Design a protein around this nucleic acid. Structure first.
Ligand SMILES: C[As](C)(=O)[O-]
Ligand SMILES: [Zn+2]
Length: 184
DNA sequence: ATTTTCAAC
């Protein structure tokens, strides 16, 4: 049915390590893009896809998604509601590529939730996030409900509830403030 | 378990 999953789900320790939202965490070299997609076609039942992309034919996760979407998914006369949950926000090359992809495809609507802001203090990365926002993508910080959603849908949770870590809300508030300063 | 965000010299 609509249970189609692209890629592999994370084990719990991989999720907890990668989606930790301390603004300056060390040793998180991977980029995880979880996604859900609503496929809306006028005379068909609405269908759903979800999955997980990582880095690397070499490719950052955001580009891996776009390349898979264009090559395997994107159809005529179909609307797409896409939500991303990324562990790191995009680099400027990825941000520019996603922005240009969205300009090319009016039928695709993208919402980006991000656990952390990658190089938020660098103006080239700020510009990248700004251009993403200006081309119609809503960029947001992952909060409690978003981490809980990912735990439920992209993790081998083994029916255990999401356990939020200490500092999750404080970190969210710091990051959301920095994001609003960037998008101003 | 008052079932892990917040409880802040
Ligand atoms: C967060 As990246 C370095 O895959 O654009
Ligand atoms: Zn990139």
């Amino acid at each position: 049915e609509n249970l189609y999953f692209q890629g592999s789900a994370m084990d719990p320790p991989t999720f907890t390590f990668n989606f930790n939202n301390e603004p300056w965490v060390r040793g998180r070299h991977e980029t995880y893009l979880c996604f859900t997609m609503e496929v809306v076609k006028h005379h068909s039942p609405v269908s759903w896809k979800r999955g997980v992309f990582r880095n690397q034919t070499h490719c950052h996760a955001e580009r891996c998604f776009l390349s898979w979407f264009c090559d395997d998914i994107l159809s005529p006369n179909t609307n797409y509601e896409v939500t991303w949950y990324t562990s790191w926000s995009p680099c400027p090359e990825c941000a520019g590529e996603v922005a240009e992809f969205l300009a090319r495809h009016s039928n695709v609507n993208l919402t980006i939730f991000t656990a952390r802001l990658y190089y938020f203090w660098d103006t080239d990365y700020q510009e990248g996030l700004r251009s993403l926002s200006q081309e119609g993508a809503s960029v947001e910080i992952m909060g409690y409900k978003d981490f809980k959603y990912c735990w439920e849908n992209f993790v081998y949770n083994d029916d255990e509830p999401f356990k939020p870590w200490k500092g999750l809300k404080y970190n969210f508030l710091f990051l959301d403030s920095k994001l609003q300063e960037i998008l101003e």
